[PDB]
């Protein structure tokens, strides 16, 4: 509350560390469905169904330009990528499986870096 604060967690490395995680997600062999924005002219249904499209290149641009206020808003966009994927793709598809694999990969790096 006013003049009453928990001890200050050091967040000075969060930017660099989110960048490193994002690099590792970019270079994963199953990243290919997520590298670029879904083409809304060429994928029927995507624009209407997926209210907030997100992809790794968009997160990279947001990260690089100070559009994440903190590490949690960064995690929310990464998770959005996978939530969107699950919304649009059957589990038993190459892209559906990719999304599960990448979400697992992310969540482990996230826990090991920050928890």
XYZ file of N, CA, C and O in Angstrom:
460
model
N 0.919 -1.203 0.000
C 0.000 0.000 0.000
C 0.920 1.203 0.000
O 2.164 1.045 -0.161
N 0.381 2.421 0.186
C 1.252 3.639 0.293
C 2.398 3.518 1.269
O 2.210 3.373 2.481
N 3.633 3.720 0.739
C 4.882 3.669 1.550
C 5.172 2.240 2.174
O 5.948 2.116 3.156
N 4.534 1.249 1.606
C 4.664 -0.186 2.065
C 4.821 -1.079 0.896
O 3.854 -1.435 0.185
N 6.076 -1.490 0.671
C 6.427 -2.303 -0.509
C 7.185 -3.538 -0.196
O 8.090 -3.425 0.629
N 6.795 -4.657 -0.808
C 7.600 -5.890 -0.852
C 8.973 -5.591 -1.406
O 9.135 -4.654 -2.215
N 9.973 -6.387 -1.021
C 11.335 -6.197 -1.546
C 11.406 -6.201 -3.112
O 10.637 -6.973 -3.750
N 12.269 -5.318 -3.657
C 12.359 -5.099 -5.138
C 13.055 -6.305 -5.882
O 14.267 -6.398 -5.847
N 12.263 -7.241 -6.430
C 12.724 -8.173 -7.520
C 13.479 -7.461 -8.688
O 13.051 -6.411 -9.203
N 14.677 -7.964 -8.999
C 15.545 -7.345 -10.013
C 14.978 -7.757 -11.396
O 15.021 -8.939 -11.759
N 14.375 -6.789 -12.063
C 13.825 -6.979 -13.445
C 14.732 -6.413 -14.566
O 14.300 -6.344 -15.745
N 15.955 -5.981 -14.228
C 16.849 -5.295 -15.199
C 17.344 -6.163 -16.393
O 17.788 -5.634 -17.444
N 17.313 -7.446 -16.195
C 17.634 -8.444 -17.207
C 16.438 -9.114 -17.952
O 16.649 -9.948 -18.840
N 15.248 -8.700 -17.619
C 14.041 -9.388 -18.176
C 13.998 -9.227 -19.720
O 13.643 -10.192 -20.444
N 14.248 -8.012 -20.183
C 14.254 -7.730 -21.642
C 15.184 -8.663 -22.401
O 14.765 -9.347 -23.353
N 16.444 -8.772 -21.963
C 17.401 -9.647 -22.550
C 17.008 -11.086 -22.459
O 17.248 -11.882 -23.375
N 16.497 -11.481 -21.304
C 16.143 -12.859 -21.112
C 14.890 -13.277 -21.970
O 14.879 -14.387 -22.521
N 13.896 -12.383 -22.055
C 12.705 -12.667 -22.980
C 13.200 -12.812 -24.458
O 12.738 -13.679 -25.218
N 14.168 -11.955 -24.828
C 14.767 -11.988 -26.180
C 15.404 -13.334 -26.455
O 15.263 -13.905 -27.508
N 16.098 -13.886 -25.472
C 16.745 -15.157 -25.602
C 15.773 -16.301 -25.731
O 15.980 -17.191 -26.495
N 14.753 -16.313 -24.900
C 13.682 -17.269 -25.037
C 13.025 -17.208 -26.435
O 12.770 -18.286 -27.017
N 12.701 -16.013 -26.861
C 12.051 -15.817 -28.163
C 12.972 -16.335 -29.269
O 12.493 -17.031 -30.151
N 14.322 -16.099 -29.153
C 15.288 -16.673 -30.114
C 15.213 -18.184 -30.192
O 15.160 -18.784 -31.312
N 15.075 -18.864 -29.057
C 15.035 -20.262 -28.986
C 13.716 -20.796 -29.584
O 13.685 -21.826 -30.204
N 12.639 -20.051 -29.366
C 11.342 -20.440 -29.945
C 11.433 -20.247 -31.510
O 11.018 -21.158 -32.242
N 12.002 -19.134 -31.972
C 12.224 -18.868 -33.413
C 13.008 -19.968 -34.152
O 12.738 -20.232 -35.313
N 13.965 -20.592 -33.484
C 14.876 -21.534 -34.101
C 14.446 -22.948 -33.911
O 15.064 -23.871 -34.476
N 13.414 -23.228 -33.123
C 12.854 -24.578 -32.988
C 12.303 -25.077 -34.337
O 11.641 -24.333 -35.109
N 12.536 -26.340 -34.607
C 12.131 -26.883 -35.907
C 10.602 -26.871 -36.160
O 10.188 -26.866 -37.312
N 9.789 -26.794 -35.121
C 8.358 -26.785 -35.202
C 7.754 -25.332 -35.105
O 6.559 -25.218 -34.901
N 8.597 -24.357 -35.231
C 8.189 -22.987 -35.172
C 7.483 -22.508 -36.451
O 6.863 -21.452 -36.423
N 7.695 -23.223 -37.574
C 7.252 -22.731 -38.914
C 5.780 -22.252 -38.991
O 5.568 -21.283 -39.735
N 4.794 -22.826 -38.246
C 3.448 -22.230 -38.356
C 3.236 -20.867 -37.720
O 2.154 -20.247 -37.938
N 4.274 -20.445 -36.946
C 4.166 -19.304 -35.980
C 5.139 -18.191 -36.320
O 5.155 -17.198 -35.604
N 5.970 -18.324 -37.343
C 7.037 -17.340 -37.608
C 6.527 -16.018 -38.128
O 7.112 -14.974 -37.804
N 5.433 -16.075 -38.868
C 4.879 -14.911 -39.558
C 3.433 -14.823 -39.299
O 2.737 -15.849 -39.004
N 2.828 -13.642 -39.453
C 1.381 -13.554 -39.277
C 0.618 -14.458 -40.319
O 1.097 -14.648 -41.468
N -0.453 -15.048 -39.852
C -1.359 -15.825 -40.717
C -1.878 -14.872 -41.790
O -2.229 -13.730 -41.412
N -1.883 -15.310 -43.069
C -2.298 -14.381 -44.172
C -3.858 -14.336 -44.222
O -4.491 -15.315 -44.571
N -4.410 -13.236 -43.763
C -5.856 -13.084 -43.586
C -6.617 -12.987 -44.893
O -7.838 -13.242 -44.911
N -5.926 -12.651 -45.986
C -6.536 -12.729 -47.334
C -6.604 -14.155 -47.837
O -7.506 -14.449 -48.592
N -5.679 -15.043 -47.435
C -5.595 -16.368 -48.025
C -6.061 -17.482 -47.161
O -6.049 -18.624 -47.620
N -6.466 -17.204 -45.921
C -6.937 -18.284 -45.014
C -8.329 -17.967 -44.608
O -8.612 -17.185 -43.652
N -9.285 -18.545 -45.395
C -10.698 -18.414 -45.017
C -10.976 -18.708 -43.545
O -10.488 -19.691 -42.976
N -11.754 -17.841 -42.949
C -12.252 -17.973 -41.595
C -11.391 -17.330 -40.511
O -11.872 -17.018 -39.449
N -10.114 -17.142 -40.833
C -9.146 -16.705 -39.760
C -9.451 -15.361 -39.182
O -9.466 -15.195 -37.935
N -9.747 -14.408 -40.084
C -9.968 -13.033 -39.687
C -11.180 -12.900 -38.776
O -11.144 -12.227 -37.738
N -12.285 -13.558 -39.159
C -13.483 -13.504 -38.289
C -13.395 -14.267 -36.990
O -13.917 -13.885 -35.958
N -12.745 -15.415 -37.021
C -12.722 -16.273 -35.860
C -11.683 -15.846 -34.811
O -11.938 -15.913 -33.612
N -10.525 -15.450 -35.286
C -9.350 -15.199 -34.354
C -9.261 -13.721 -34.087
O -8.827 -12.975 -34.942
N -9.749 -13.324 -32.923
C -9.997 -11.911 -32.729
C -8.671 -11.130 -32.533
O -8.580 -9.946 -32.878
N -7.657 -11.802 -31.992
C -6.373 -11.182 -31.771
C -5.227 -12.063 -32.310
O -4.645 -12.877 -31.541
N -4.931 -11.958 -33.611
C -3.839 -12.744 -34.256
C -2.526 -12.368 -33.599
O -2.326 -11.205 -33.170
N -1.657 -13.367 -33.440
C -0.322 -13.095 -32.872
C 0.659 -14.091 -33.453
O 0.255 -15.252 -33.765
N 1.914 -13.689 -33.639
C 2.922 -14.580 -34.225
C 4.291 -14.142 -33.672
O 4.410 -13.028 -33.130
N 5.323 -14.974 -33.908
C 6.656 -14.674 -33.328
C 7.281 -13.426 -33.886
O 7.906 -12.681 -33.098
N 7.085 -13.132 -35.189
C 7.658 -11.884 -35.754
C 7.064 -10.575 -35.187
O 7.845 -9.590 -34.946
N 5.769 -10.603 -34.860
C 5.029 -9.536 -34.230
C 5.478 -9.381 -32.788
O 5.855 -8.234 -32.317
N 5.657 -10.489 -32.083
C 6.229 -10.392 -30.706
C 7.629 -9.828 -30.764
O 7.985 -8.971 -29.917
N 8.452 -10.279 -31.734
C 9.817 -9.736 -31.861
C 9.827 -8.246 -32.097
O 10.602 -7.499 -31.394
N 8.953 -7.749 -32.966
C 8.884 -6.322 -33.214
C 8.388 -5.517 -31.967
O 8.893 -4.421 -31.641
N 7.404 -6.055 -31.254
C 6.891 -5.440 -30.043
C 8.029 -5.401 -28.959
O 8.192 -4.363 -28.234
N 8.741 -6.504 -28.802
C 9.817 -6.614 -27.834
C 10.917 -5.550 -28.114
O 11.345 -4.818 -27.234
N 11.353 -5.532 -29.359
C 12.410 -4.641 -29.814
C 12.071 -3.162 -29.739
O 13.011 -2.288 -29.866
N 10.835 -2.778 -29.612
C 10.400 -1.400 -29.695
C 9.731 -0.932 -28.413
O 8.965 0.031 -28.396
N 9.962 -1.681 -27.310
C 9.424 -1.279 -25.979
C 7.997 -1.264 -25.786
O 7.443 -0.501 -25.007
N 7.280 -2.174 -26.503
C 5.857 -2.280 -26.370
C 5.349 -3.331 -25.321
O 4.133 -3.466 -25.119
N 6.292 -4.045 -24.695
C 5.974 -4.852 -23.509
C 6.330 -4.094 -22.194
O 7.530 -3.931 -21.896
N 5.300 -3.754 -21.406
C 5.593 -3.092 -20.131
C 6.267 -3.977 -19.141
O 6.997 -3.469 -18.329
N 6.053 -5.300 -19.185
C 6.708 -6.136 -18.220
C 6.769 -7.589 -18.812
O 6.169 -7.869 -19.874
N 7.457 -8.481 -18.106
C 7.639 -9.861 -18.628
C 6.278 -10.627 -18.723
O 6.116 -11.501 -19.592
N 5.270 -10.298 -17.922
C 4.001 -10.979 -18.026
C 3.213 -10.641 -19.308
O 2.508 -11.485 -19.865
N 3.323 -9.400 -19.768
C 2.610 -9.047 -20.964
C 3.295 -9.773 -22.140
O 2.637 -10.060 -23.073
N 4.595 -10.022 -22.067
C 5.337 -10.807 -23.052
C 4.798 -12.254 -23.080
O 4.412 -12.754 -24.157
N 4.689 -12.856 -21.895
C 4.172 -14.284 -21.814
C 2.746 -14.380 -22.350
O 2.368 -15.389 -22.939
N 1.916 -13.384 -22.100
C 0.535 -13.402 -22.561
C 0.456 -13.462 -24.129
O -0.323 -14.181 -24.693
N 1.282 -12.690 -24.814
C 1.338 -12.785 -26.266
C 1.909 -14.110 -26.778
O 1.424 -14.583 -27.773
N 2.920 -14.719 -26.102
C 3.423 -15.978 -26.544
C 2.268 -17.000 -26.399
O 2.001 -17.784 -27.288
N 1.589 -16.954 -25.257
C 0.486 -17.947 -25.001
C -0.660 -17.735 -25.998
O -1.296 -18.704 -26.438
N -0.940 -16.496 -26.368
C -1.921 -16.135 -27.366
C -1.659 -16.835 -28.684
O -2.602 -17.336 -29.314
N -0.392 -16.952 -29.075
C 0.008 -17.620 -30.307
C -0.543 -19.084 -30.227
O -1.135 -19.619 -31.179
N -0.295 -19.722 -29.101
C -0.736 -21.127 -28.964
C -2.201 -21.374 -28.746
O -2.755 -22.391 -29.261
N -2.864 -20.477 -28.052
C -4.300 -20.431 -27.919
C -5.012 -20.226 -29.200
O -5.950 -20.979 -29.566
N -4.519 -19.316 -30.009
C -5.052 -19.169 -31.376
C -4.901 -20.414 -32.193
O -5.852 -20.816 -32.935
N -3.731 -21.022 -32.089
C -3.435 -22.243 -32.869
C -4.469 -23.335 -32.491
O -5.001 -24.035 -33.383
N -4.677 -23.502 -31.206
C -5.625 -24.538 -30.726
C -7.060 -24.218 -31.145
O -7.857 -25.137 -31.393
N -7.409 -22.943 -31.176
C -8.730 -22.507 -31.649
C -9.025 -22.920 -33.129
O -10.168 -23.357 -33.481
N -8.037 -22.813 -33.991
C -8.188 -23.011 -35.405
C -7.765 -24.349 -36.003
O -8.186 -24.640 -37.150
N -6.976 -25.162 -35.278
C -6.359 -26.330 -35.852
C -6.716 -27.558 -35.005
O -6.756 -27.485 -33.762
N -7.080 -28.616 -35.702
C -7.334 -29.876 -34.988
C -6.057 -30.307 -34.275
O -4.920 -30.239 -34.827
N -6.212 -30.910 -33.088
C -5.063 -31.532 -32.365
C -4.261 -32.550 -33.214
O -3.051 -32.602 -33.178
N -4.980 -33.381 -33.997
C -4.388 -34.362 -34.852
C -4.121 -33.739 -36.248
O -4.752 -34.101 -37.278
N -3.262 -32.727 -36.274
C -2.748 -32.118 -37.517
C -1.318 -31.744 -37.264
O -0.895 -31.664 -36.125
N -0.539 -31.519 -38.299
C 0.834 -31.144 -38.112
C 0.904 -29.816 -37.336
O 1.733 -29.696 -36.432
N 0.065 -28.856 -37.715
C 0.123 -27.535 -37.061
C -0.403 -27.642 -35.616
O 0.188 -27.029 -34.677
N -1.429 -28.482 -35.385
C -2.023 -28.632 -34.058
C -0.927 -29.223 -33.133
O -0.761 -28.791 -31.967
N -0.229 -30.253 -33.585
C 0.824 -30.861 -32.814
C 1.990 -29.898 -32.558
O 2.544 -29.828 -31.454
N 2.330 -29.125 -33.591
C 3.377 -28.116 -33.487
C 3.049 -27.189 -32.343
O 3.990 -26.810 -31.608
N 1.803 -26.739 -32.303
C 1.397 -25.766 -31.250
C 1.506 -26.316 -29.823
O 2.033 -25.695 -28.899
N 1.123 -27.581 -29.661
C 1.309 -28.205 -28.354
C 2.738 -28.338 -28.003
O 3.037 -28.052 -26.845
N 3.625 -28.780 -28.956
C 5.023 -28.965 -28.709
C 5.659 -27.613 -28.294
O 6.428 -27.481 -27.327
N 5.316 -26.552 -29.051
C 5.952 -25.255 -28.769
C 5.487 -24.684 -27.442
O 6.298 -23.973 -26.773
N 4.265 -24.855 -27.093
C 3.737 -24.364 -25.810
C 4.484 -25.024 -24.629
O 4.966 -24.345 -23.703
N 4.614 -26.359 -24.713
C 5.495 -27.071 -23.757
C 6.922 -26.566 -23.662
O 7.443 -26.318 -22.551
N 7.625 -26.392 -24.800
C 8.910 -25.865 -24.878
C 8.996 -24.500 -24.205
O 9.939 -24.225 -23.452
N 8.039 -23.630 -24.546
C 7.999 -22.288 -23.933
C 7.840 -22.321 -22.404
O 8.629 -21.642 -21.707
N 6.916 -23.116 -21.923
C 6.525 -23.080 -20.521
C 7.670 -23.572 -19.652
O 7.927 -22.988 -18.527
N 8.461 -24.503 -20.179
C 9.636 -24.968 -19.456
C 10.692 -23.912 -19.406
O 11.218 -23.658 -18.332
N 11.013 -23.251 -20.531
C 11.963 -22.194 -20.499
C 11.532 -21.064 -19.587
O 12.406 -20.356 -19.029
N 10.241 -20.791 -19.576
C 9.710 -19.699 -18.786
C 9.929 -19.970 -17.256
O 10.408 -19.119 -16.523
N 9.515 -21.138 -16.827
C 9.721 -21.622 -15.445
C 11.211 -21.673 -15.078
O 11.572 -21.161 -14.010
N 12.074 -22.233 -15.942
C 13.494 -22.330 -15.632
C 14.196 -20.990 -15.596
O 15.193 -20.856 -14.888
N 13.737 -20.004 -16.374
C 14.388 -18.698 -16.396
C 13.931 -17.774 -15.243
O 14.714 -16.978 -14.793
N 12.665 -17.853 -14.856
C 11.993 -16.855 -14.037
C 11.364 -17.383 -12.706
O 11.172 -16.595 -11.807
N 11.061 -18.673 -12.575
C 10.480 -19.250 -11.331
C 11.508 -20.092 -10.535
O 12.701 -19.772 -10.514
